[PDB]
Amino acid sequence: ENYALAA
Amino acid sequence: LPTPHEIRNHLDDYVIGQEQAKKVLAVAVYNHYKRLRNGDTSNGVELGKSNILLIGPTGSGKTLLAETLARLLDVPFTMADATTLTEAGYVGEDVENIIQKLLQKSDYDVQKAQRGIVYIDEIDKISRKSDNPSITRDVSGEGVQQALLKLIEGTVAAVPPQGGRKHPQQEFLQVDTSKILFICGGAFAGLDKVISHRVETGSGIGFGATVKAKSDKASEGELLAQVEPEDLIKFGLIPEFIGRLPVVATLNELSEEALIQILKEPKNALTKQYQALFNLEGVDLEFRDEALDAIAKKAMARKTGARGLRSIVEAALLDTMYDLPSMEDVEKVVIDESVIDGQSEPLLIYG
Amino acid sequence: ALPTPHEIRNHLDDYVIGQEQAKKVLAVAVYNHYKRLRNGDTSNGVELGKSNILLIGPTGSGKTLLAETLARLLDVPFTMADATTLTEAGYVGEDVENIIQKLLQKSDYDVQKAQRGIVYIDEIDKISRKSDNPSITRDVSGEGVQQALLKLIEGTVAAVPPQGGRKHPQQEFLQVDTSKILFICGGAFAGLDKVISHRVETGSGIGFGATVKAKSDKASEGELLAQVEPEDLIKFGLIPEFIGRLPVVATLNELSEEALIQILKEPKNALTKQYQALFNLEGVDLEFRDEALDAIAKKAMARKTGARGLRSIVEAALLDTMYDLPSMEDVEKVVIDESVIDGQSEPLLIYG
Amino acid sequence: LTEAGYVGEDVENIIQKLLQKSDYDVQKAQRGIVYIDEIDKISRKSDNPSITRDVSGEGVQQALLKLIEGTVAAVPPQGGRKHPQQEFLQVDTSKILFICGGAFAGLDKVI
Amino acid sequence: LTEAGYVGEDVENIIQKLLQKSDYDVQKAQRGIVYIDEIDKISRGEGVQQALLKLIEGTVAAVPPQGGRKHPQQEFLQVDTSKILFICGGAFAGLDKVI
Amino acid sequence: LTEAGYVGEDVENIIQKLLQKSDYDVQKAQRGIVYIDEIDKISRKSDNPSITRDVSGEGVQQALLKLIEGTVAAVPPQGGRKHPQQEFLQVDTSKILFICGGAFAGLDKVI
Amino acid sequence: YNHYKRLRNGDTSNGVELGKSNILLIGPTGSGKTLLAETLARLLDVPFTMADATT
Ligand SMILES: Nc1ncnc2c1ncn2[C@@H]1O[C@H](COP(=O)(O)OP(=O)(O)OP(O)(O)=S)[C@@H](O)[C@H]1O
Ligand SMILES: Nc1ncnc2c1ncn2[C@@H]1O[C@H](COP(=O)(O)OP(=O)(O)OP(O)(O)=S)[C@@H](O)[C@H]1O
Ligand SMILES: Nc1ncnc2c1ncn2[C@@H]1O[C@H](COP(=O)(O)OP(=O)(O)OP(O)(O)=S)[C@@H](O)[C@H]1O
Ligand SMILES: [Mg+2]
Ligand SMILES: [Mg+2]
């Protein structure tokens, strides 16, 4: 349950 | 079903000083609904989709017109924000969520959702920008515009079936966006500069030449009507995006007459708020007619819209509010025109 | 009963010195905020809208200190946030909504209690653009934060994880409104005085008619900032949309020499008291003469770092004494004269 | 170090390093000493384009302000990168001492 | 596209826009029509023209398939621009005097 | 192509295109050939010394030197730019052949 | 050679910490700078890496 990508 | 006169009448009850914009919104909304009823329209010609684009300065009724419209109409209405939106697969948000929220408002009635409205505020914030070396990637921008564009052009959208549990049975009901109405708004700050260059050729130098002063600068008020798609593209929008929004409702800056009405005519007007504030404090507040005119002149100068009014009133009553609780036996407070300018301080009845 | 603004200002006066206008604004807002909190039902057809505050002042004026003092006296939840850490949605830095989460913690996750809360966003001038122009690149740590804060200030529903995002996939995120939350955005706008001068100090040419002040008659930042208007802020880098949400603009004056002398001794946690306590636990008594305090104020004013300058002047004067004082024995009192600040003399010592 | 939201290391990472020394004992780290070397490498370029952002030099100074003065800073346990939807260890830098250093080049000319 | 920064991504985006309309069909997309506007403005942006002509001459472009959070390099669809017809438009006001 | 640190473009993109032609088979790319066009544009023609910076010209030649000579090159997976991300595969250009072609204008006058 | 000597006395039982002295090679083109490094890597047991400062 990893988090979404962040720029 | 609703008539434009009815729409404008309901809007006028809550909005002040946007006669032309209200007309455009009413006409566009009515025509859009008439288009949905007569899908075939007994003709080979297909009517262009009328999606409104609201352009106006701060504190002019953009975010208010949308809310008032929702109150009147019965169809679903969702108020999104472009700032939250981001490119797909990022932490911020997704564009598909808009339809999801729309269905929740419509009780998951796909038939009703396809007939709903959608208001996107702060659309100017997703304007295209030049690449930054330090930033990893520019997600809140062009990418979001393309997602909204594919949503506006008309495409099926998959919505989970109420999110019953981890596994929702993968129903992924399809929602069509071809019949949905979009109202994209935002104060395109800096657009007046782009428009000015395009339509202003400067001034001459001779005797016969017409010299133009700063008062003739032709600022955003009366300068946003001349806007063309080329100016928006320079601001950062996509050309195809503009073509999807033919209707361009422009909101002019609020005049002193409109501001004075806002001070007293609304049910939750600024003057009524302070009166209630004083009333629960055992005091009665009275605003003179001259004072309201002075407040509007100061607020207009600030170029902050109707929100400026609170700044002027707060400053005038700052000292009074600070020492009114300590003062005893005071039943009424009167604000004269001088109080707004600061030369005098507000008469207090000690009866 | 309800605390009146006079009572609130007195508690602020104990720790703050000289900021009368700013103290009034905060006192009035807190009183109005409590009035709204009590009259939550509002049995009338009127919605009492909030007025956000914007604190502007030089360094060492008392902005952050005012917020800290306020927290001590605030029954409702109060949190202090830094705008530097915030970033626009979708970026590595942070999410603006985190402030509300920080606020809920203060209220033990009582949404109804948090909604009626106060927030102080410090360093608000550091999320500003460089010019009036919209932008040239994505200003994540800048206008992007301002664009994100608009909805937070005006009023909206923000999502918040109650305990942990990883405990459950959705975790039934809490929805908390902000239409009633009060915001106090405080920043030390640097270069704003220059902007106002260009708009106010006209006729700055070269001829006879032109006025040249030679940095003597020139109005200081404290006097100039008093004439601040939103248009000046737009040029500094703020968004028009962001100022309208902050109608109340309270300004803090530059600290004069007399105010600095008061700061040294009168406040509860005054600088002199701190050094006296440091020596007191060491077995020594520290005495400051009145002449010394006047000298320290003049030196600190030159630094143009606010009241923080005082610490530099005092620490430098007591550096030699603090270094060799523990080695010394039988020393019970230390006296600082006016000459000690200049450096010509050595602080007098008492043995016994 | 760099300003928040950019690819470079954040300013809160300093506290993370401090936690390593204290076996992740926040109470023990809040009373620590910190030495920030090469503090002269973060300086405003006076003669530079107005419309730009000095994330490396000015942003770092802006970010360190609340840290030096004292604030409840968010500290990722590992500290590699900051993620908004991530658990953070709140640390207070009001008692931490900072000793900045750096060979200022060209200061003698300014003086 | 006159910015002249990461032109490869910007020109590639054009192809990506076509695929969305093409329903992510490489065969149908390769038959598409591309219209470029205001081609006169870039003239004086030599780098912009150089990037464009490579796209006009024909090249293979990598477009992410059906969006997605993260996808491997190989998964990217390979479309050829040699088979795509490109139309360049624009008004050349000064050109009349030149003739 | 631009000097590293500038937003225009980087010199590693070349190898990226080469990988695409080899189906991302590194061992098959190292044995490849690369044609670099418009090399004369990089030449300092109207140099006007670059005390501020030289990005489109001398800054590109300096970068290519090791690429041509042969060194491991960090290549992003696909259509990405360099960043702290560690999702980079190393490619060796020691055996790659380079054919730099340019329509040098005014060289005849120099000769 | 000195690098190897410092590695042998990992413990360094003395009140002395040996500090490294870095090298700066200056020379014209086609002189042997890069070549010297490559040759060194052939006979270097300790990890040797080559970096390009332009990137
Ligand atoms: N025409 C109007 N009639 C009545 N109240 C108005 C009008 N225009 C502005 N107001 C007042 O201003 C408030 C905000 O108006 P908005 O329509 O939100 O302005 P805005 O265009 O949304 O500003 P932003 O920040 O650019 S979204 C309303 O709640 C009213 O109190
Ligand atoms: N009016 C004041 N009364 C008492 N102490 C003060 C006053 N102004 C400054 N100080 C002292 O200066 C310290 C810092 O004051 P702050 O208000 O935090 O400065 P500032 O306004 O935050 O400037 P910043 O944070 O760089 S924007 C306080 O902790 C006090 O010790
Ligand atoms: N002293 C030398 N002995 C043997 N071969 C040499 C010598 N100097 C140069 N060479 C040859 O020249 C080639 C390049 O030498 P390098 O040392 O790489 O040049 P350089 O010192 O790197 O100059 P740069 O890197 O272009 S500034 C080598 O591969 C050898 O073939
Ligand atoms: Mg709005
Ligand atoms: Mg502060």
Ligand SMILES: [Mg+2]
């Ligand atoms: Mg060629």
Ligand SMILES: [Mg+2]
């Ligand atoms: Mg070499």
